[PDB]
Amino acid sequence: LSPEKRKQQLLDYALDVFARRGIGRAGHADIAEMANVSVATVFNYFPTREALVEQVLTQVENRFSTMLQTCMGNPGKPLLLRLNCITHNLIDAVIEQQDWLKVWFEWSTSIRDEIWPQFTHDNRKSLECLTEMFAEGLEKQEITTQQPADKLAWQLYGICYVLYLQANLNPDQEQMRELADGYVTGLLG
Amino acid sequence: LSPEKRKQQLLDYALDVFARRGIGRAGHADIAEMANVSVATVFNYFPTREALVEQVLTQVENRFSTMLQTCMGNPGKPLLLRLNCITHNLIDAVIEQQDWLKVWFEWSTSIRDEIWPQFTHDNRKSLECLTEMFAEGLEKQEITTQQPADKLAWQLYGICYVLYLQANLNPDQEQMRELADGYVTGLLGK
Structure with missing residues (x-):
């Protein structure tokens, strides 16, 4: 998956869980599980929880x-x-x-x-x-x-x-x- | 002290952390630490996190x-x-x-x-x-x-x-x- 592909998938999923559970409550590990990627992959795109938010x-x-x-x-x-x-x-x-x-x-x-x-x-x-x-x-x-x-x-x-x-x-x-x-x-x- | 006052104290602490961190962002263990009581005390008044919220x-x-x-x-x-x-x-x-x-x-x-x-x-x-x-x-x-x-x-x-x-x-x-x-x-x- 290309990097622009991947970043938009992760942002989509993060917005999705924010809407379901509340802003900033899901961890990088939660996003990783929704995207079926490693946790390290999410941190590669968003070095901190606050950067994703x-x-x-x-x-x-x-x-x-x-x-x-x-x-x-x-x-x-x-x-x-x-x-x-x-x-x-x-x-x-x-x-x-x-x-x-x-x-x-x-x-x-x-x-x-x-x-x-x-x-x-x-x-x-x-x-x-x-x-x-x-x-x-x-x-x-x-x-x-x-x-x-x-x-x-x-x-x-x-x-x-x-x-x-x-x-x-x-x-x-x-x-x-x-x-x-x-x-x-x-x-x- | 008395049970209804002890329960009110826990509700007040929960309101404090809800306002600071968000609704439902404190577990029973956090409330117990705030109130200097056992975790079991909080579950006695609030059997679930949903009951406390x-x-x-x-x-x-x-x-x-x-x-x-x-x-x-x-x-x-x-x-x-x-x-x-x-x-x-x-x-x-x-x-x-x-x-x-x-x-x-x-x-x-x-x-x-x-x-x-x-x-x-x-x-x-x-x-x-x-x-x-x-x-x-x-x-x-x-x-x-x-x-x-x-x-x-x-x-x-x-x-x-x-x-x-x-x-x-x-x-x-x-x-x-x-x-x-x-x-x-x-x-x-209007």
């Missing part, structure tokens, strides 16, 4: 930010369509039980762990991405300026959190999209 | 529901004061580095096992509490009926999550209360 979380952040940027579409895409894209993709990601989204949200509440500084720093770009989208909407009179764009971004973040919990409770696309459209309509008003 | 999370939920209940106050309390109470007590708990609140939010995103079924079941009473609060505010025209009371309750929960994150970033009560009042002011127009 940060590289999995970097991939999780990239999945999150790529989802948002894809929803931004081309310039001039209406704020409403961007917001519906974000909520509908979040809902569908819960329905498919995507590992990265489960790990992202667990990362967000790992306050006391060495990984939380990575969460708050690495995800500034997504906060700024959402802030720019609301600021654009402000400029185009698609939403009022009663709240600063950054506060609207945080508000949307909280909506994504409750949608995430509600969709895990009830992974029904139609019912969940009705809830999400209600939140977005209220946010836009 | 479940009972710590029950205590965590009790703290959350108690905080909401005391914010509800007397039957006539205005919605604004109830909402300000919840957000201000949440911010204060972050400033105090309260173990129960850290574990509560970690629990909320630990979609696994029977611990997450325990999260959704045990906190249903808090969702109902918040729903009744908004329904009462609707009946007294403290907030419009554009959205159902249950949807406002969920919205406030998202506000609490973002306030929790922002307060852990910046502890300043003054700045954090201004942020919280901004979210509550916004919610009350």
Whole structure:
């Protein structure tokens, strides 16, 4: 197996067990058993337990930010369509039980762990991405300026959190999209 | 000392290590060392690791529901004061580095096992509490009926999550209360 082949297999499996058991709970030996490789092989690719954790979380952040940027579409895409894209993709990601989204949200509440500084720093770009989208909407009179764009971004973040919990409770696309459209309509008003 | 006090001491130690290392990241041997008791003593009160985890999370939920209940106050309390109470007590708990609140939010995103079924079941009473609060505010025209009371309750929960994150970033009560009042002011127009 080529080295790029192998590294992505190990990262996949590490993300998988993180989603099932929690961030950073599985050892290199556990990853080795899932990949049917020696423990030394995993250490060759990730010299420390912490190096594997940060590289999995970097991939999780990239999945999150790529989802948002894809929803931004081309310039001039209406704020409403961007917001519906974000909520509908979040809902569908819960329905498919995507590992990265489960790990992202667990990362967000790992306050006391060495990984939380990575969460708050690495995800500034997504906060700024959402802030720019609301600021654009402000400029185009698609939403009022009663709240600063950054506060609207945080508000949307909280909506994504409750949608995430509600969709895990009830992974029904139609019912969940009705809830999400209600939140977005209220946010836009 | 007495058995119910000894068991409470073990639960408190388990909550401490759960907050530091993560839910379920301490065995009975670790708790025994923390409490200066035999390992058999811990198994006498908690026959399994799952029993200890479940009972710590029950205590965590009790703290959350108690905080909401005391914010509800007397039957006539205005919605604004109830909402300000919840957000201000949440911010204060972050400033105090309260173990129960850290574990509560970690629990909320630990979609696994029977611990997450325990999260959704045990906190249903808090969702109902918040729903009744908004329904009462609707009946007294403290907030419009554009959205159902249950949807406002969920919205406030998202506000609490973002306030929790922002307060852990910046502890300043003054700045954090201004942020919280901004979210509550916004919610009350919606």
